[PDB]
Amino acid sequence: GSQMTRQARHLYVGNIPFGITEEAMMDFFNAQMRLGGLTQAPGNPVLAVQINQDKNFAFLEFRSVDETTQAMAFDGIIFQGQSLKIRRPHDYQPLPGMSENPSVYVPGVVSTVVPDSAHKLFIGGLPNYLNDDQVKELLTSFGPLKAFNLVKDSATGLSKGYAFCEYVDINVTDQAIAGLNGMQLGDKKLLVQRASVGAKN
């Protein structure tokens, strides 16, 4: 369809695996939607994927407004080691009577949106070659995460060596600090503290 028609029928997907094909991306999201019970009709909700490989993002094109909205619940899903960053197009406008936010939660998926808050953590000193899944697994031993993002270099996809997170249980925050702060990992030592402590400004 037209560009206007696509505003409510596609999503931005950032942090995509290097070298993934459009077909493999499409098959992944169709499988996740179908196997998660998140379709509104028989068949595949995702019609196409357009990748910008040099800029490390894709747009997923859906056949329906409601399926596009529900797919926002996959923000943070791990695929080939990467946490996919799912967002609305910047020009999205809510449509009359159509939900702006997903209605159903997808078990296991940890959001990449980590707002500044009392118990948001900064994790610094990570070896830059560890991927999102590996860092997530390091943090999850203390308890389940509500949100997590590993900061990547825009040009290499390598990490910048630091991440942010928020635990489901606010009390896990201090347990994760106690366990991980000062821990040797590679040639590095981790720094783990509430992000408000060292935030620039």
Residue numbers in the entry: 141 to 341
Give verbatim lines from the article.
U2AF2 is a critical pre-mRNA splicing factor for the early stage of spliceosome assembly at the major class of 3′ splice sites. Structures of the U2AF2 RNA binding domain show an “open”, side-by-side conformation of the RRMs binds to uridine-rich Py tracts. Considering that the NDD-affected residues are located near the RNA interface of U2AF2 structures, here we investigated the hypothesis that disrupted U2AF2–RNA interactions could contribute to altered pre-mRNA splicing by the recurrent NDD-associated variants. De novo mutations affecting the pre-mRNA splicing factor U2AF2 are associated with developmental delays and intellectual disabilities, yet the molecular basis is unknown. To address this question, we determined the X-ray crystal structures of Arg149Trp- and Arg150His-substituted U2AF212L bound to Py tract oligonucleotides at 1.4 Å resolutions.
The Arg149Trp, Arg150His, and Arg150Cys substitutions decreased the apparent binding affinity of U2AF212L for this consensus site by approximately three-, four-, and five-fold. For the Arg150His variant, the N-terminal U2AF212L α-helix shifted closer to the oligonucleotide. Arg146 appeared to be disordered by loss of a Glu201 anchor, as shown by comparing electron density maps in. Instead, Glu201 has shifted to interact with the mutant His150. Water-mediated interactions with the mutant His150 replace direct hydrogen bonds between the WT Arg150 and the N3/O2 atoms of the penultimate nucleobase. Neither of the amino acid substitutions significantly perturbed the other site–i.e., Arg149Trp has little effect on Arg150, and Arg150His had little effect on Arg149. Instead, the NDD-associated substitutions converged on disrupting Arg146 interactions with the terminal nucleotide of the cocrystallized Py tract.
